[PDB]
Amino acid sequence: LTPDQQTLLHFIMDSYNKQRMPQEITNKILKEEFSAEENFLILTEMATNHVQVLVEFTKKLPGFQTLDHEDQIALLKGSAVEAMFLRSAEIFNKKLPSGHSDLLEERIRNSGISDEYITPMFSFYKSIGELKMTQEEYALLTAIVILSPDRQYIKDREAVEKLQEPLLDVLQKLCKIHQPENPQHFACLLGRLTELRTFNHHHAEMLMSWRVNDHKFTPLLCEIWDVQ
């Protein structure tokens, strides 16, 4: 609605859309049943991808520059899993040809991840698809997640609050703009955030378990998630 808001919305969308998800890598695993290790190597590339565009999007967020530098880091490390799963959901729902969900689930059981965690991942992917999430919502929700003022190691919550609230205000106007008949849409969105939050634990477990089974990561993946 507000000019300050239309500018914010647009700056956020430009930045989110600039982030390129080359899909060669994905069409790789689609057309070929690789070996567990080689699948994992492909995952390592996808994960690296996620961190990279994460940081490229976060850099640009209006005001992110004005935060103390150790809060900058702390937001990044705290949001990476949540943001990475959101972007994964967008890719599942937009950048993959139809009718390959099961095949892709095969490929992921096979990468040394336990079913215990795969089942929740794809359910989340589908729940998002059922909301027919828009490009605005992906980008807003991503920014809202990154600028969560509730993260650990944040020296100055209020500064982060300041930057997250206008995002929240906008998102809920758009919910009402494009779905004035569904006043509850915004609340469903937030419920998807709560579900996102459960991946932090799953992710730490996915890593601790990969590591015990002799997988090696990259420096960078080790920094962001403190594997030491």
Binding site: Q52, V55, E56, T58, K59, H69, Q72, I73, L76, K77, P219, L220, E223, I224
Partner: peptide, 10 residues
């Protein structure tokens, strides 16, 4: 955290 610091500042 030298690497994220590099990717944040350029």
């Amino acid at each position: 955290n030298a690497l994220l610091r590099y990717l944040l500042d350029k």
